[PDB]
Every structure is written in C-alpha cells, then in structure tokens.
Symmetry: D2
Subunit: 389 residues, 4 copies
C-alpha cells in the first residue's frame, strides 16, 4: 500500500495542488516535498513554507548548485555539445532533480515518487527515464497524465476547494525554466516562428542595442577542459558562472532564438539565454583547436551530436553516457591554458590564447605526400577516362 510519496516540488500552483490531490487519490498518504536550488533565484524558504502549508509532512530544500556545475555543466562544457547545433541544453537539470528526488525517496522509504511535468513536453520523459535508471522499483505518479485538470482556471478552481493559496501575480506570459546555466522562454506568441522575439522576453541579458560602448576583456584559465579562474582569480564553478553570466549578460551575449525538434511531439520555438555558457563554449573550442590533434578533434566533434541527443532526451543515467564521458575525459587531459576574449555588443571576440600543451609551433616531402594522397583519384580518373564529376 502507498503510505508515503516524495514529490518534486516547484512551488508553482500545479505542484501545490498536487499535494492534496495525491493525498486524496492515495488514501492516507503522506507527501514529502523535495525542493532543489539550481539557481532559479527564487525565495526557497517561501516555497518550503508553501509546501508545508499545502499539506506536505516534510519539505526538503537541497542546494545542488555546485553539484549541478561540477557533475553536469562541466561534463557538458567538456563535450562541446549543442543540440541540433543550436540549443545549449539547459534541461540537463532534469536528471539532477530526479536524482535528488530518488535519493530522498530511498532515505524516507517512500512507496512512490511524483513529479509535476505536463503530459505534452519532453520533461516527463527526462524525469521518468532518470527515475527508472536510478530506482526501477519505485512507482511513479504523474498527476498531469491522470487528473481531470486541463487549464490554469481549472487548477484555480481545484485550489480554492482544497485550501491551496492562489498567488496574486499571474504566470508569466511565457513558460520559463531558470537555472545557473540558462533561462528558457517558450509558449505564448513565441509559438509562431514568423514573429520576431518580443521586447519583454529577456530576463538576464541586455538587448544588444543597450550594451556598453566600451568592450570588456575577460581572461579564462582552463584545466583539463574546465574553467578554474576568471581574470586571474580562482573561483568556484558557481562563482565563475555567476560572474561570467553578469559580465556577458551586460554585453548582450548569448541569446538563441531557435526552432528545435522535440523527442515527444513536433517542433518548438524557444528563446534561450545563456551568457556564461556561450563564453565558456567559445573559450573551450579555442583551446581544443590548440591542444588536440586533428584526428582527436575530428573524432570528438563527430560524437558531439550523439552526446547532445543523449542529454536532450534525458538519457543521462546510462552506460552509453558513461562510455562517452570516458572518451571525452581522455581528450580533455591537455585542454589546459589561457584564453582572452573581448565582450562587446553581443560578440565574443578572440583576443589571444596560450597553452603549455599547444601543438602550434620540406618541399620534397610535400611532393611525395601529394602523389600518394592523390593516387586513388588518378587511378579512378584513368579507369573512368573522360568521365565527369
């Protein structure tokens, strides 16, 4: 019998009404709320209190910002992966949320876990793949796939009948996800790809026309593929991301307006802000061009899409991911050095780089190489004498 349920709790109206909903559809069930700090810059104590006031017996707040950076964002930087060559993969946070949920579930000996992902997007897949990979014995409850609530107004009606406070402010005009790595904006007038990005979307990035008229120099030190210092100051991953997000955001850097293919459904138009991510991706690419051999670089670049698809689809916890990580970690052993960049009006402008492991340093040799490199073409053309290309 289901006596205890752990709920991944966002503090929004949806997951708040899920608490009484769970307690009514699973008679006499206790609900434990799990709240993750990933950098959404919300009042987590207020969210904790709302969980308790909504009927949760316990409400955990776990600060996972450093673990997000070191265990997820740093492997992502090392991979250089961009989904469909465009999307910065901020939904990499979903496996971590699932992992904290399962960890507390097992510590609290709950009979089931629940999440608030809707029945329409990829997020439900990302959560439930991760839960099954970490704890295949745990029952999963997805109230959006079971209940009769279909609109916000219907959720409001339910909240009133079940003692749940309805916030005064409306949900944003756009559906948003926010962590230390990115901010996403979807829905509303954004669903029409024929329409330009409205001027009220951006939250952490200055519009390019409102950026300083003087460039800003940043110097990034990397060790084994990840940044360890900014402007000569060693900083924790979170402090470095925070500082670079502010600096690059002030200079308007990193906004992506893209259409991407979902796994679940068709296509989605979104706006994605990630100033620090764009700067780190640029610096990392620069250093790899100096420190990797041609064959290593080419093989690694050919695996980036595989890595991006895996992360995008929520397959973080899989042996396939572990094997890619092992490959990537070897390629990163010498990606160590210094990159200077100028930030200016939405541009990340290279301003020099160096590495102790830089690989950058006869005429008769060339002729021999040419003759053998082109021998196949010569034989083919002799065989197909007079043929066209």
């Amino acid at each position: 019998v289901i006596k205890k349920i752990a709920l991944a709790y966002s503090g929004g109206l949806d997951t708040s009404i899920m608490i009484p909903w769970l307690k009514e559809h699973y008679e006499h069930a206790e609900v434990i709320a799990v709240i993750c700090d990933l950098g959404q810059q919300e009042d987590l104590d207020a969210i904790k209190n709302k969980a308790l006031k909504s009927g949760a017996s316990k409400a955990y707040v776990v600060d996972v910002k450093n673990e997000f950076a070191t265990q997820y964002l740093w492997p992502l930087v090392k991979s250089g992966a961009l989904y469909e060559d465009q999307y910065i993969l901020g939904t990499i946070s979903r496996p971590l949320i699932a992992q904290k949920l399962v960890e507390i579930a097992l510590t609290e000996q709950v009979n089931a876990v629940a999440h608030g992902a809707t029945g329409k997007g990829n997020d439900q897949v990302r959560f439930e793949y991760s839960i099954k990979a970490l704890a295949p014995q745990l029952e999963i409850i997805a109230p959006w796939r079971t209940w009769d609530i279909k609109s916000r107004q219907e959720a409001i009606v339910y909240a009133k009948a079940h003692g749940i406070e309805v916030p005064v402010t409306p949900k944003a005009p756009y559906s948003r996800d926010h962590n230390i790595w990115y901010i996403s904006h979807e829905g509303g007038v954004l669903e029409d790809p024929s329409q330009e990005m409205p001027n009220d979307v951006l939250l952490m990035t200055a519009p390019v026309s409102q950026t300083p008229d003087e460039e800003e120099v940043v110097v990034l030190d990397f060790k084994k593929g990840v940044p360890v210092a900014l402007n000569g100051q060693e900083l924790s991953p979170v402090d470095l991301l925070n500082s670079l997000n502010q600096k690059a955001g002030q200079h308007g850097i990193g906004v992506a307006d893209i259409v991407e293919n979902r796994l679940v459904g068709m296509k989605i138009r979104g706006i994605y802000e990630a100033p620090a991510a764009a700067v780190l991706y640029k610096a990392h690419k620069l250093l790899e061009s100096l420190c990797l051999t041609r064959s290593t670089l080419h093989l690694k670049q050919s695996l980036q899409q595989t890595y991006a698809n895996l992360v995008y689809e929520g397959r973080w916890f899989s042996q396939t991911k572990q094997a890619l990580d092992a490959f990537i970690d070897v390629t990163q052993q010498h990606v160590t050095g210094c990159v200077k960049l100028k930030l200016f009006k939405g541009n990340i402008i290279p301003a020099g780089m160096h590495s102790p492991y830089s690989l950058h340093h006869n005429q008769k040799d060339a002729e021999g190489f040419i003759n053998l490199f082109s021998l196949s073409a010569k034989i083919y053309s002799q065989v197909h004498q007079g043929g066209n290309y």
Copy 2:
C-alpha cells in the same frame, strides 16, 4: 617534348617570374597564362597585359563568378558545412581554378600545367588532386618545389634580371586570398595565436565599434536550399552575394579568428571575412530547422563534417563528393521559404521565418511512449541493482 605549358596566373611576382622560368627550363616551350575572375576585384586587363609582357604567348581571362557561385558556393550553402565547426571554406575556389586550367589546357593541346602554390601549404594538394582527377595524363609542374629561388628577395632579383616589373611597395603584412565568398588573412604576426588580431587586418568588414547604430532588416527568399531574392528583389547569385557582402560587412558581420588543422603540416591561425556567407548560413540553418524532419536533420548534420573535410582537403572532384551531393540535394527539395534577419553590430538576429513546407504546427499516448522508451533503462537497472552511473 614539352612544347606548351598552361599556367594558372595571378599577376603577382611569383607567377610572373614563373613565365620566364618555365620558358628557360623547357627549351622552345610556349607558356599560356590562365586568369580567372573569382571576385578578387583586381584589374584583370593589367594582369593579362603583364602576362603577355612577361613572355606568355596567350593570356586567357575567364569570368567565372557565376560558375563559382552556382556550381561551388550554392552546393556549399546547401551542405551547411564548416570545417572544424569554424572555417567557411573559401579555398573551395581551388578546384574551380584547376578546372579552368585543365579546360583550357585541353583545348590548347598543352603537354603540362603549372601552378604557383608554394611548397608549404595545402593549396598545392588542392590544385594537384584536382588536376589528377580531371586530367590524369597531364604533367604537373610546381616551380616552387623545383627552382633555386628561396626568398622573396631572391624572386625580386630574378624578376629584375628578366624584365619583370617590380615596383617599390613593401611586402604585405599578411598573406591574403580574396574572392566573392571570403577574404583570408594569414602569416606575419597572425602566426602567433597568443596575439590579438591587429587593427589593420580587415578589408571588407567594419570593426564592430564603427558599425551603424541602427539595425538593418534583410529578407531572404530561398528555393530548394539556395537564396533567390533579397528584400523582395530577385537577384542573380553574384548580385545577391555582392549586395549581402556590402550590407553585412557594413554591420561588421562574419569575422572568424581561428586556428585550424592543415592537411599538410600542423596548425594555422587565420582571420577570415565572409559577411554574406555568415548571413546565408544563418538563414539556411533556420529554414532547415523548420522544413526537415528530426531524422533528416540529424543525419544531414552528421555528414556536414565529412563534406567540410572533403572540401578542405581539395577532394571536390571525387565520386565521394558526388554521392554526398545527391544526398544533400534530396534534403534540400523543400528548403523553400522566407527568412527575415536583423543585421546589427556584428550580430545576425532572427526576425521571423515562414515556409509553405513548415513542419511546425494525447496524455495517454505520452505514458505509453515513456514506458517503452525507458524500458531498456529499467531492465538494465534491475539487472545491475545497486550500481552507479
């Protein structure tokens, strides 16, 4: 016996002195100069007269700008290829130069062809692969690999001794290549990747600090993957490239400061200007995200590197390339529509797109998909109970 030689002639000092050198090292050999207009914006009449003055019996001048755009740049645009995810592949001009050299060689009954590529770069490979692929029976002469001339100073001594005009004008600070698609800058202080780009490199692209304070809207119409109209005006490929190069260059767009792996040698640091190419690449990528299925998009993106490497290495005239083109052409059948872009201070900002072939338009279905998509992960975790990722 070598009675006739066709030379790919640029009008520079090197290929100018090759004319008397060829005539002296092959007694009673006649030298035919071949001059291609690829958009280098030089005085072609002067180059022709200089070839004849230097001792060429004939000097062909061929305007190949439309052939370059329609037979090389348009397939490149359709491919979406960027070498090592950075380089716009302006050396795609080398197979076309070789193609015209061979076409004229064969109508002139020449015994050998010559080119002025140095013994150190990739260009000798690109030229000679193409010549062997198109005319394996033609002997190739590369005087940079043969003669006793070692320095530019030595080439000047030789030129004076043979009546070749050498005006006092200092050595260019950078080695440059220029066609309708791009400008490359290499050598000199650019060789050191720790050194920022000097402020005298750029020739067709405004530094971002001097770009207009008002954005410029461009509207591009594509048909089957290639642009056919700009701002509602149907334009030839050459006119469209010229117009877009001017507009995007004024707004500072398209400069790449990169380190790449050579085929012959190690790494090279270069600055590349390609304003129209950057805009076309952006618009093409946007339209592909709207018009291709996920499976077609992912497969095509996985072949971009193969195509880029093939173009970079000079393997244009190969059955491998023909097979890639046939693949790409199918994927481009519906890449038709309109992309609006804002050009502003080095940025290409999406401003809306639409296509008659846009692919952008249940809760129980999702649950079934989730369960089968995650089934392997569930089984794997049950088998490896207690294991980590």
Copy 3:
C-alpha cells in the same frame, strides 16, 4: 460512420476471425481483404476464397514479388546493410504490405484500414508508420489492441462460433514469416538463448551435415550494384532469387542464429534463413571492394547502420530514406562486373572476380608521405615528452 474497412489479410487464424469481429464491432461495415504475394509459397486462391467465405465483400490478391525484389530487395542489396551487423531485414516486406493496403483503401474509398499485427512486436510499428506516411487521413484499426481475445485457444473458440474453419492441427512450435528473401523463426524454445537451435527449425536450408560433398560454382553478373545474370543466363530478379535460394539452400548457406534489440520491447532470439541473400551480399561486398575508392567505401560503410536501423524500424517511407537512396545510387554506378563463388557446406568461397571498372592495377614519394602523415604524432610526442599511450 465507418462503412468500409480494408484489412491486410494473411489467411491465418488471427486475420481470419478479424473479418467477423470487424463486421460486428462496426455495424453495417463492409470488409475488403487484401492479400499480398511476397513469395510465402502458400495457396493464395485458397486464402482468397476463405476471406470471401468469412464475409469479406471483396478479396484482392496482389502479386508483388517482382516489385518487392526491384523496389525493396535491390535497394537493400545495394546498401549492404545488416541490422546490428547480423540481421538480413526480411521485415522489409512490411512497408510494401502497407503500401498495397493503402492503394486499395484509397481506390475503394474505405473509412479505415486494419492489420493483424499483435500488440507486442515491432510489426505494428512498421505497419502503422507506413500507413501514416502514405495516408495520414486514414483511421487505423488494430484488433489485437482492442478485442477481448487473449490466447490462441480463445481465438479458436471465437472462430468456431463465427463459422470459420479451424481444423485440428497442432500449434506450430515456432512463429514464422516467409517471403522470397528470408524465413524467420521465433518463439517457443527459441526464446531461451542458452538453448541451441533445435533440429526441426530450418525449412529451406539444409543442415550442414547433409549438404553435398562436391562444391557448386555459381557466377553472378552485377550491373549498377544488383545481380542481372546467374551462370551466364540473364534472369529476372525473382527468378534469380528463386534459383539462388535453391542452390545456396541445398549447400546449407545463410542461417543466422542471433539475438537482436527490438525497437518495441527488449531483445529477441530468432533463426533467420536467407541463402540467396547471403550469396548476393557476399558478391556485392567483393565487387564494391574492387570498384569503389577507399573514401567512397569507408563513407558508405559508415552509413550502412543508419540504413539498417531505418529499414528495421519501419521508416521506409521517409525523406531520410530517399536521401540515403540517392547517396547509395551514386556509389553503385560502377558496381558492375562478374563474381565467381564456390558454394560448399555452409561456406561461400571466393573463386575470382573482375570488372571493367576495377581500380585494382617511388621510394622518394613514400618518404615524403610518411613524414607528413606522421608529423602530428611527432609534434605531439615532442610536446608531451616522455608521456605514455
């Protein structure tokens, strides 16, 4: 209101009882049976008559052996694809069955189509993906996913109560699929991979221990990647497949005992017979090794898996497949020549090959090629002085 239903009809118990089931669950609905000849070597007039006896208003028998060979098997031979490097892809018949069902559906102006695939295998995916690709407006009815019949014995009870002949013949020990390309055997004791293949599985391939003691020479002529003659006799595709299946089957060739990953579900063990396929695949691989450049061969081999997965998953009718076919077709332009093979006790033994397009025909060149090919390795080893591999 559903007035007409087209059903893909095999004559087996399942699709036989689907006729009365459909007629009872869609009142006043007429059922049109569609029977395809793919080489299953059954009495199709008997199947036709049985559909009519069970209440079908029309029963089509479509002879698609020729088109199966030239439109499906010939592209497959040209691709060289084997699913997971093992499986000969006999389920390539499913899109063709769906295609014929849809053509008749459209002609007869039916309101829905039906197929008899179970709710457990990949086949339901292959059928329904194809129907959606060809006729997105047609409703699909899958009785296995709807009716109250759970077991074969329940199906038998249902048949007797609806006038359908079920004579006493025992349950087949294996589930089988048979067409001109292959025979599959699955289920029963084959489900356990720790159990060797029982001695009563094979139907068209002799056990190796009873094969002739004298080898048999076969000579295959290929044109543009497909076989056109056998032992100097030009034969239609179906005649050549029939003859080669007989000859190679007599000599015990082509049995695969394999475990494969499904798309829907986990893993499946099956026995697959395909004697002619194995011989054609061998001859095709030999001719490619003679006629393709290294770069073309390597790229095509890299795409075999993509092609195999696409065919395996039922994605035949897709732009992705069209683009792959255009690639493959270029690579096959010169795969033309003669291959002699000795068939002997399960072995396909090369006995010589030749082609008018065969590509098979200095010390100073080698030194130059070696030095440039190994230059990156030398530089890397100097930078990482003393490091290990």
Copy 4:
C-alpha cells in the same frame, strides 16, 4: 654522430644484408639486432646466430607473445573492429615491434633505428609513425628507400660480396606475415583478383573439404570482453589462442580472401588465416548482443570502423586511440559470460550462451509509443499531401 643503430631483424636475406649495408653507409657504426617472438614459429636461435654472423654486435631475442596478446589482441577483441568489414588486422603487430625496438634502443644508447619494411607497402608507415610517437628524437633509417638493391637477385649479389649467407631454399611463392593471431599471404599469382586462391597457400587451416565429419564443441568463458577459459579450463591468453588456433584450424575456419584498400598505394588482394580470431570475434559479438543496451551497441558498432582504420594505418600510439580504448573499456564492463559454439566444416555455429548480466528476459503502451514515434511522419505527409517516396 651515428655510432650505434638498432635494427628490427627478421632473419631474412633483406635484413641480413642490411647489417653490412648499415655499417658501410654509417662509418664505424655498431648494429644491434632486435628479434621479436610474436608466434612466427621460426628457429629464433638460428635467427640470432645469423644476425651475429652477419656483423651485429648483439642480437636480442624477446618473447613478446604474452605482451602481444594482452596489450594488443585483447583490446582488438574488445573493439570488434574489422578493417573494411573484412580484414582481421594482424598487422597490429607492427606497433609492438616498433615498441620493442625503441625500448631496447633507449637501453643501448643508440642514435638511430632501422627497419626492413619495403618502400611500397603500409608497413613502413606503421613502423615510422610508431617510432615518432614513442621516440621523436631517434633518427629512422629505411634502407629499402635508400639503397640500390631492387631485386632478389641483386640482394643475392650484394650478399655474396659482403659475406652474408644466402639460404638454399627460395623465398615462398607468397609474401607472408605470421604471428599468433594470423597468417597473411600476398603477392605472386594472388595479385590477380580474377584468379582463385591456389591450393598451396594455406599454412595453419585445413581446406574445408578436408575437415572432420563430426563437429567439435568449444565453450568459451569471457570476463570483461576477453576470453579467460576454454572448455572449462582457465588458460593464459597465449595458451588459449594456441589451443583455439589448432581446433578451429583443423575444422577449416577463418580463411578470408579479400581485396582491401591500402593507405599507401592502391588495392591489395590477400589471403588471411586466423582461426582463433574468427571464433573469438563470433563469441564476443554474441555476448555483446546479450549484455549491451541497444544504444550502447549501436554507438560502439559505429566506432568499430574508426578503430579499425586507426589500427590499419599504424596510429596505435595516439591520444585518439587512448580515447577510443577508454570508451571501449566502459562498454566491456559487463561483457561476461559463457558461449558454446560448434565448429564444423568452416562454420562457427552458435550452440547457446548465457551471462549473469544478460538483458534478455502492455498493449496500451504500444499504441502510445506508435502514435508518438510516427507523429513526425504523419505531420510530414499532411504537409506534403499527394507526394511520393
């Protein structure tokens, strides 16, 4: 100055006359001979004595069979790599020979190393890539690229004039390479792919017609992707290879007659015997089909070609190979179990397998998966109404 040279010494006439040749072209140079036992089953004492009699100051004989099996063949087995899907990569011995040569050279204070690979094949590249990767400071001498000896008779003339014994028996009709993993046969009448393999080629494999009339069962136990026991008996890698080569060779297993693309040159026809390799590859492929997830299997199979090309080209000692190895080692963690095989008349017949990590063990779920899996095709077909595939 070059006072001391280490020579990779095979005992043949070529490397024997290289000893006086080296001493004459490098005045007063000492020559150290290095002889590797890789399983070529020759009289190594006679070879050592011939080296000393030919003028070597020292002749090292090193038994490297276990090092070859554990550090080269076992990684190859784990990779599953077959060059161009055909060639078993017995030239994997070349990096090991180069490794021993360099190891001894650095203990003997030699200034240069020499090898006897000819100026025509891939072997020179394999040797010299490895030497540069392991010891870029060592000068390399390849007498076949420098001396004036062009024929066997010219080598005999030189040997007579320089005190080198000429063997009574001729060189074999075929050029051969032999180690514990394989035997290769090339040259002679084998250069003609239209000609069947002659009946005097095979050395360790029975002709299929001369194999036992009763099958032989073998049972292989694998741990982490490599075999550890045969027929229930734990065996060292060398003993297991020796025993399996004998058993499978007696049953005629493992002969490949192929045409492959060289790196250096065009195409080469060879005969390759590797009985144990074929059996190990089969068993390994079987266990991977049981123990890996679909996504891991497909990704690993996509990297086999990259691995095969790397090995074939002699790039063993590279960071690219190290990164692949790290990938592979993760995938092999659970490739542990038992494979029973029947050996019979050239066939390797599966006879059951099991693993403690085997991954082999609803109707509403399937319908949801089908609808979402095929949604893209449905949307595409609605957009392109009336279009063909």
